[PDB]
């Protein structure tokens, strides 16, 4: 069994996609659930898990079966505990895009996540580990990571810093190897 990963902080998305592509035998994504009606070319259980009934899925959310859910384009979407458990029981590390709130939910589910926070040193530091964002978004993001650390600090399995994203990817890599 392999621990699910949650990367938080700036660069999470890039880190996640990199990991997925770079080591697809080591890493996987879980199948999310949606109440949106399945397009004809879509495959139930691969692209999404397609729920017949919005009332149905609201119940499961109520029933705690999901670690994350929200609404988009008027439909529910979410990550079930079970779809994470399937990846993790596949011997693969499940790459999660989820809020820090999800970690308490993962701990609670016995799924023992690996939660990694990426801590910017300064506003400027954010810009140096992130090429393609504006100065305003860097600001909004530094303040964001601060509020995140204040609240969720006790949830982090580990905290990384760096001058370059490359340095950080390397660090994120080590941490993951170290826990297995």
């Amino acid at each position: 069994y392999a621990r699910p990963i949650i990367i938080l902080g700036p660069t999470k998305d890039r880190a996640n996609d990199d990991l997925l592509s770079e080591f697809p035998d080591k890493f996987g994504s879980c199948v999310p659930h949606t109440t949106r009606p399945k397009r004809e070319y879509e495959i139930d259980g691969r692209d999404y898990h397609f729920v017949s009934s919005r009332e149905k899925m609201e119940k499961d959310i109520q029933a705690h079966k999901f670690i994350e859910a929200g609404q988009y384009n008027s439909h529910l979407y979410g990550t079930s505990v079970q779809s994470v458990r399937e990846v993790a029981e596949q011997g693969k590390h499940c790459i999660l895009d989820v809020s820090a709130n999800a970690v308490r939910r993962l701990q609670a589910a016995h799924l023992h996540p690996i939660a990694i926070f990426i801590r910017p040193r300064s506003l400027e530091n954010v810009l140096e580990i992130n090429k393609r964002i504006t100065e305003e978004q860097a600001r909004k993001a530094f303040d964001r990571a601060t509020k995140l650390e204040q609240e969720f600090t006790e949830c982090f399995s580990a905290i990384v810093e760096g001058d370059s994203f490359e340095e950080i990817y390397h660090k994120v890599k080590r941490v993951i190897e170290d826990l297995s």
Partner: peptide, 12 residues
């Protein structure tokens, strides 16, 4: 071939 699940990433 696998879906890009854009709705999902897009979700708030």
């Amino acid at each position: 071939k696998k879906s890009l699940r854009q709705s999902f990433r897009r979700m708030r």
